[PDB]
């Protein structure tokens, strides 16, 4: 629950990224970087320093699930929480992501209260 925890907000809609970034700031988390797709995020995650990944399920080039599976397979970031963002809960998606290792799901649009409950729950299931 460290306020300086560095977030990576991955989403191909720049407006969605700003929303998430403002929601985060609002909660007290100001260390936020953005990525527009799976590849982009990996390029940034490489540099290190990251602590939390907020990712959109649906992205061109490298989607949310393929990004999560790549992180999880990465020796070094294999343990980064990944909160999946979707516009519609679907059981098969939730199940796919579950097995690939997603830290949770948030259905957009969402409020800061919702984003906070999500984070809190993740921070907790992680003994974090």
Q: Which residues bind Ca ion (CB under 5 A)?
A: 12, 56, 58
12 among the known binding-site residues? yes
In the complex, residue closest to Ca ion by CB: 56
* Tokens, residue 32: 């936020």
- Asked if 12 contacts 60 with a C-beta cutoff of 8 angstroms, the reply is yes
Check the annotation: does 61 bind a ligand.
no
Is 56 part of any known ligand binding site? yes
Distances (CA, A) of 79 to 13, 20, 70, 128: 26, 22, 11, 12
* Residue 3 CB contacts under 8 Å (≥ 6 apart), including other chains: 28, 29, 30
**CB of 5 or CB of 67, closer to Ca ion:** 67
Shortest distance in whole angstroms from residue 116 CB to Ca ion? 22
To the nearest whole angstrom, how small is the minimum distance from the Cβ of residue 12 to Ca ion? 5
Largest Cα–Cα separation, the chain: 34
Nearer to Ca ion, 40 or 56 (CB): 56
Q: Which residues are annotated as a binding site for Mg(2+)?
A: 11-12, 56, 58
């Amino acid at each position: 629950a460290d306020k300086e925890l560095k977030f990576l907000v991955v989403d191909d809609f720049s407006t969605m990224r700003r929303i998430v970034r403002n929601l985060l700031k609002e909660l007290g988390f100001n260390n936020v970087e953005e990525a527009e797709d799976g590849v982009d995020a990996l390029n940034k995650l490489q540099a290190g320093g990251y602590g939390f990944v907020i990712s959109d399920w649906n992205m061109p080039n490298m989607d949310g699930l393929e990004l999560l599976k790549t992180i999880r397979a990465d020796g070094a970031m294999s343990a980064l929480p990944v909160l999946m963002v979707t516009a519609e809960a679907k059981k098969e998606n939730i199940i796919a992501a579950a097995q690939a290792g997603a830290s949770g799901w948030v259905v957009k649009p969402f409020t800061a209260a919702t984003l906070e409950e999500k984070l809190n729950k993740i921070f907790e299931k992680l003994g974090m």
